[PDB]
Write a protein that binds this DNA or RNA. Sequence first.
DNA 1: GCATGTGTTCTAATTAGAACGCATG
DNA 2: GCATGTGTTCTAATTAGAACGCATG
Lengths: 285, 285, 174, 188
Amino acid sequence: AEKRKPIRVLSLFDGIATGLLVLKDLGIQVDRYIASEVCEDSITVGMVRHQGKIMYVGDVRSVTQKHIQEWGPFDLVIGGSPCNDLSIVNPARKGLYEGTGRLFFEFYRLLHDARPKEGDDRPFFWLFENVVAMGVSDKRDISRFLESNPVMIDAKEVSAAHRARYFWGNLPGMNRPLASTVNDKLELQECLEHGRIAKFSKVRTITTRSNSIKQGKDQHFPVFMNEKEDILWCTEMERVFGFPVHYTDVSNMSRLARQRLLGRSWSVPVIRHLFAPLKEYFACV
Amino acid sequence: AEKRKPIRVLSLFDGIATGLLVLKDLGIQVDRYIASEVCEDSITVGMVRHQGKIMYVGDVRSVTQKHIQEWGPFDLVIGGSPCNDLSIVNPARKGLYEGTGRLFFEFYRLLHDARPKEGDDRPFFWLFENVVAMGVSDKRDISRFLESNPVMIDAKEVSAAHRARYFWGNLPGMNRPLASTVNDKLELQECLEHGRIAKFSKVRTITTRSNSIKQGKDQHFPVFMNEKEDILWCTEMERVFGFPVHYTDVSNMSRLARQRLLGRSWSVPVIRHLFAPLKEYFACV
Amino acid sequence: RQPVRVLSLFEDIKKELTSLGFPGQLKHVVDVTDTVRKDVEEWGPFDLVYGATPPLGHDRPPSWYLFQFHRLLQYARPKPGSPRPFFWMFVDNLVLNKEDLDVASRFLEMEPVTIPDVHLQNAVRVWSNIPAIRSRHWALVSEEELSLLAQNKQSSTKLVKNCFLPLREYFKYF
Amino acid sequence: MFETVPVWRRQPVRVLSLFEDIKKELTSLGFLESGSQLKHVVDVTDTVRKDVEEWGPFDLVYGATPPLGHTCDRPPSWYLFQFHRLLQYARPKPGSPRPFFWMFVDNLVLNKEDLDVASRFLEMEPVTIPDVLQNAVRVWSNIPAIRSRHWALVSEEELSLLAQNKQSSTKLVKNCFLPLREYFKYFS
DNA sequence: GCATGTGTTCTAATTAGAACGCATG
DNA sequence: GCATGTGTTCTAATTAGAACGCATG
Ligand SMILES: Nc1ncnc2c1ncn2[C@@H]1O[C@H](CSCC[C@H](N)C(=O)O)[C@@H](O)[C@H]1O
Ligand SMILES: Nc1ncnc2c1ncn2[C@@H]1O[C@H](CSCC[C@H](N)C(=O)O)[C@@H](O)[C@H]1O
């Protein structure tokens, strides 16, 4: 070619647009950011925090190949399908082929549709994220359909919380070790507001369940304030996840609704690490 | 010529520390800011947003004459006592002498205790706020105890909301005409998040009643958003009041708890208009 | 020893102060709502400022009398440096509930003295900067009996006028 | 890849049959010599791409859900998704000389939502082939004569009934392979 | 081993919305 | 004028908290 060009992204199960946030933070110029999402709160956050840059296309099952060919070409295809039927924290999980588990195959389908034709040299990148705490059979099958073995990355190395996640993909240097950057907050204390004391160095995996913010078998409170026990505030969960403060403070959402969004999202510094070497392949305003 | 010194403030019924916020906005140095407040949500907002500058001393009825003289001398005494038993929006208001209405006299008491003795000509400013929509005899009695008539200032002329309030006090130029500034958001459209359309120019008085955010006897929705109508968001209420965005996003408070705080609070640009002449009397940043 | 100028609020005390032998030198005001500072000042200096709640079962909130008393009392004080003797006394006939009593003590910056009449029969509470009211060790009487006295009174003055007694040193008699 | 080719230049079809074997059907129709070309795999869970390429070039990829009965060990959608996966594995390079066909057959085990998924992944609506209502099957394929012919219309209400009688528990149904005769060698 | 977990479903506690009120500028 | 209001209360929907869960690294 001649010069770098703005990146074109297909984001499946976009959530609160973590991908676009990270692309923006790395200075990468974005041509188009197409997002498949069905949750109203998620769509609102993405619409507001990114000023309508995101082209929303609704349910992933409504995305036809004709749509992919028309909206494309895409340089980057990213996503993390629901795990509420895949994660072993749900006793009533229905597995990969039932419930919301089969939504994974929608990603496999669209990735297949998005891939350049035979003889097309142009750079093409994809990333799929899901949990470690899933059945060995579901992990196997995901690997088979994606024709790749995942890389396990825990956000504890680069943030203030345990978050062991699998990442399938072809991003340059997915396998390299995570180095802490200057900006990362590695301890819970760095994430607290003024006058609050951390009782733990790192918190554990934050789910959509309210009390996932409590620690251990004993369900201890995470922080001290005025010599009294307290849970994490929303702004603090956002710092722990790596989001800007008050990122989820939209649409009069309650603590539950906010934690619901955060609990499903990616750890920002982890995505920053994975996306980092893409700025070499694309324009950088 | 003796140099100007930082201001020393006693704030009764401080609420969410609007007073301190305005003083710091004007660039006025503050040596001590002693606040009387009971609501834990209020105190928390104050502690966090001002990084623990405010010395909280608890219930106003526990503040003694001796405490005022020991913590003083004060340059500025401000306050706005509860109006839930004053405002005529309450058909079950108990009046100025019962319920929370009698808390007014606590301000009257402490104000008298904070005044310089005879022969003391040092500058001493004070401000008391309450609603226009109160009983006739109650307004009179308040005027009688403070020995002053109030200036009427509606926030409508300096912000995007109706809010007709009474202000008793001796601040330099309280009567003077109001003026628009660069950062005065006069229109609701300027207070909304991206992608949201304002149906009206101004909104009516916001109270602790959630549906006071709707307009007219027909209770119209104030905003349009993506093929549906909507109310104001917490952030947008904050902008309507002139507070910094996400000012009240603390301690996992719901929409209702946040509007409860804002519903009682001052209109920030109004307080700035009233506090502005104090820049001449005290040290600046 | 000059005579005495008295400001009387709500209750007239001309009949009690004549036996005392104490524009006329007594200003009596019934309701003090529109009474501003200049009005109290114009009524000449005062040596004694009296105020008291109406008898048990007589139109206004009980706290009103206390707040208005405080306001006019502040209007009627002398210069900071003390030219002579200034005296004030607020009297309650047990109209004030527990809340009102603590408000009364907070604003008048002192605890009340309990005045009993037995040989409970009739009782009175007194806030006063009079050193003589305070140090007299009156016969102890509590609230529980005072309450029962009030409950038995709603179904339907002497030594309180001797609360005036120790003011005789200050002014001319007869 | 649509155009018909002269008889002498046609080759014996190489067949990948998954879940159910169709050797008997294609042999009776004469697609394979009675002297033993057809690879049959029951469990595809561990089947990777290299395996399929190793299994030699294919001309026809066949998939079918197991018939009504306890023969459904896997979830009904498992057969479809796996079929799609291995089908993509076995597609010829884009400038491919020979005809390449594929077929997925449902024996009414697939519910409404799963039928919707099947049509979404194979990018076409099924064809109901009724043989009588004695028997019937839903068919996805890139074989033209199958999508072209207008068979007798059948009702879902009538078909939910056949499913029930077959859950309680031929020739024309085997004519899904008929229109393939002109593309490959015929033994008789 | 053994603590862990992108969840779901129970409660009692709050939230979000609507009815009620009428004196005051 | 007459229509607006630093509120309180009551109902159904959500919240915030807790129990339940067992295969997995
Ligand atoms: N049928 C569907 N089509 C598109 N999105 C769906 C969907 N069903 C669920 N989703 C969305 O898929 C998301 C999976 S959680 C992943 C969120 C995202 N990775 C982030 O970092 O924010 C959820 O937000 C859910 O709303
Ligand atoms: N007894 C008391 N002592 C101190 N504060 C009290 C009190 N009773 C009520 N309050 C507080 O008085 C406040 C009156 S509303 C005034 C809020 C403030 N002017 C602002 O700008 O936000 C309320 O916050 C209430 O919690």
